[PDB]
Design a protein around this ligand. Structure first.
Ligand SMILES: O=C(O)CCC(=O)C(=O)O
Ligand SMILES: O=C(O)CCC(=O)C(=O)O
Lengths: 411, 411
């Protein structure tokens, strides 16, 4: 096969355990044999991050910004148990949280639909896309234990007193021990969130819903509502009217209820935390947490980070190390690669690359849909409880490879 | 019965707004007052009443509930920008529910009202899912504000007793541009109450209990909910759980909502204030309709209760009612607010006759739909029946329930 020439380099972030094993096979068998790619490799395994005191994560984020497209393998955020078992320096923060904070933007999540997989919410016939604000709020929050009675205040001091007033807000007078936290966001970040959301709505020709709790957090959430409306009237109003699509702000309560009783087919812009929770509800409702894509996008339309949206399970790895067979789904990791390559193709105007990314995806879905070859989790979701109903982690990937070859020849 | 049942202690009634107020009075006159000799401590929480008393009536009502033990509340309107304008309100008064919950503290238990006949949007949900929502702080008592430009943001705590605690000045953020900020709190006392009520309900209903948090991100704040529940659990409920064969477990909110969507129901989800607010609507919708859900606020000591109609009022229905136009609004949620409240009243006063009445009221109400197929517009549409004849009017439904109440009260 005559290899497709990728013009610009692609930033690759390796991950942990089982997904790392899967990641290497995908790269060696499904990508490298067909593409001549310059991969800027960053090892984000727990061991690598510990050894560099998490500096490797920051470097990888900056590389993505430099080159434009990053593709990331699922990683492990160590807990107390792991820190002790592997003698880590500390409970390192989520590489994902770190990358999102550095790149900023929006994380778009949507189900990977496989006809055969049963939907847990039957009426969802059309994809629901979650546009999760990638920055601030709880993920960059300051929280602390309050040991006893005392006052708690939120204090703001402008860098320039003549252009702004200081603020000292009474938060609470404790009468006993408790907890406290403060969080923030910026208008610039919220504005980018809005631009990407409106642009995706336009590009996909879908209605856009922004949801908040601005009835309770009148200033904080109210700010998201006002910025979205302002951006809407600044550059997208007539575009939406021309396409016949709509933008509407809704109370988060009402939105999730309408989402649950709908047929899908719309985009839900959500604050960082709500986007996190709801994307799992949506992924699960469509069929499986393992069938979801996740791509971080910056408002300038120049930077993308495609990540394996399905976490790795240490149990599978344990069995893998013991030489026992496994059946871990590799679809989410395959799509991280395909969606990243698609952005690379678009940015570089390399149609041959985009075509490849699309067949890689169809060959993967058809292996399941048409050939009935799948891993344990999907077989089970399908009510196929026979041992012979699924193949091993490696068998699935070998099947996809064979399919990729076959489908590539057809063209 | 036809003699009337003597309710020993007064019941606090909080009247509401628009269409729900209309249904509320009909319920009282036809389904409650004719059978019960009850002393109702009436508090009008309509928008006009609250505006006239500068929201003082809401505070008085909450204190009456604490004084007498049981309150029954009709749905109320939380004014927004437009409403303040159209009705010249003095202020955008805060939600009465948030005010009442802050004063009484405790936990709000949300549970679906199951009518087997009504289709479920999440098919596998065959067993009730109960949401135990912490009713106190977090974002419902938060302090939020806009940040005009560059400057420092700090969370400052000053202990009342310098010897037992140190002051804290935590740098929240250094703005380089305008943005938003907020701070919130909760207390060990409130969280402990939340835990006790949750474990007791689990033991009472013999269901597994899951507490969900984002303690991976909010290590101190959310970690406190996790630690207090575990302490309380091991100290006085673990043994009983083990005897009953039920389990308690803490889960990441991400995993829990996914497991919830994939499950068959049959468990209690203890959730922080905000998550409980959002997830209860998802659960209510999933079982069939937002209008089929009960909501009862319970205090830890077990002596105070506020049964509320969770089904918000709809202005369009009210406007039609005003014009004398035909209406078909569901009253099931309002009926259960009364029944559930009367049950608490009966249990506290040890009045078996009241509890029997409350139960027959509920049975008559649901059988009116389940057996007689008599229902309002929303339920009929839920059953995929769009013909006019498929449903009855608001009044017709209530008359049907009243008739069955009389039938089933002699039976
Ligand atoms: O890194 C983590 O802890 C999870 C981040 C996340 O929400 C995602 O990758 O979708
Ligand atoms: O008053 C409000 O804004 C809604 C409160 C709520 O969530 C409830 O009553 O269940």
């Amino acid at each position: 096969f005559s290899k497709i020439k990728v013009k610009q380099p692609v930033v690759e972030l390796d991950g942990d355990e089982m997904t790392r094993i899967i990641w290497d096979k995908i790269k060696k068998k499904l990508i490298l044999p067909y593409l001549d790619v310059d991969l800027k490799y960053y090892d984000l395994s727990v061991e690598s991050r510990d050894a560099t005191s998490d500096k490797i994560t920051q470097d990888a984020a900056e590389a993505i910004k430099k080159y434009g497209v990053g593709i990331k393998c699922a990683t492990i955020t160590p807990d107390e148990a792991r820190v002790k078992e592997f003698n880590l320096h500390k409970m390192w923060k989520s590489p994902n949280g770190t990358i999102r904070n550095i790149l900023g933007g929006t994380v778009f999540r949507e189900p990977i639909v496989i006809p055969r997989i049963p939907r847990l919410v039957p009426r969802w016939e059309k994809p629901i896309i979650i546009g999760r604000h990638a920055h601030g709020d709880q993920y960059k929050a300051t929280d602390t234990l309050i040991p006893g009675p005392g006052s708690l205040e939120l204090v703001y001091k402008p860098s320039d007193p003549t252009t702004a007033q200081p603020q000292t807000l009474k938060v609470y007078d404790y009468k006993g021990s408790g907890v406290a936290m403060a969080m923030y966001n910026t208008d610039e970040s919220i504005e980018g969130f809005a631009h990407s959301s409106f642009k995706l709505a336009i590009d996909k020709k879908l209605n856009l819903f922004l949801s908040t709790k601005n009835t309770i957090l009148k200033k904080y959430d109210g700010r998201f509502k006002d910025i979205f409306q302002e951006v809407y009237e600044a550059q997208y109003k007539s575009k939406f009217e021309q396409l016949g699509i709509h933008y509407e702000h809704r109370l988060i309560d009402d939105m999730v209820a309408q989402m649950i009783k709908s047929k899908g087919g719309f985009i839900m812009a959500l604050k960082n935390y709500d986007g996190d929770v709801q994307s799992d509800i949506v992924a699960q409702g469509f069929g499986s947490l393992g069938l979801m894509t996740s791509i971080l996008v910056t408002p300038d339309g120049k930077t993308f980070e495609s990540e394996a949206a399905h976490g790795t399970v240490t149990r599978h790895y344990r069995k893998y190390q013991k030489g026992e067979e496994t059946s871990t789904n590799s679809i989410a990791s395959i799509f991280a690669w395909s969606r990243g390559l698609l952005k690379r193709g678009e940015l570089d105007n390399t149609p041959a690359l985009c075509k490849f990314a699309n067949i890689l995806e169809s060959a993967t879905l058809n292996t399941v849909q048409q050939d009935g070859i799948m891993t344990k989790d999907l077989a089970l979701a399908c009510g196929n409880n026979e041992r012979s109903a699924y193949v091993t982690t490696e068998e699935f990937l070998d099947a996809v490879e064979k399919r990729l070859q076959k489908e590539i020849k057809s063209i």
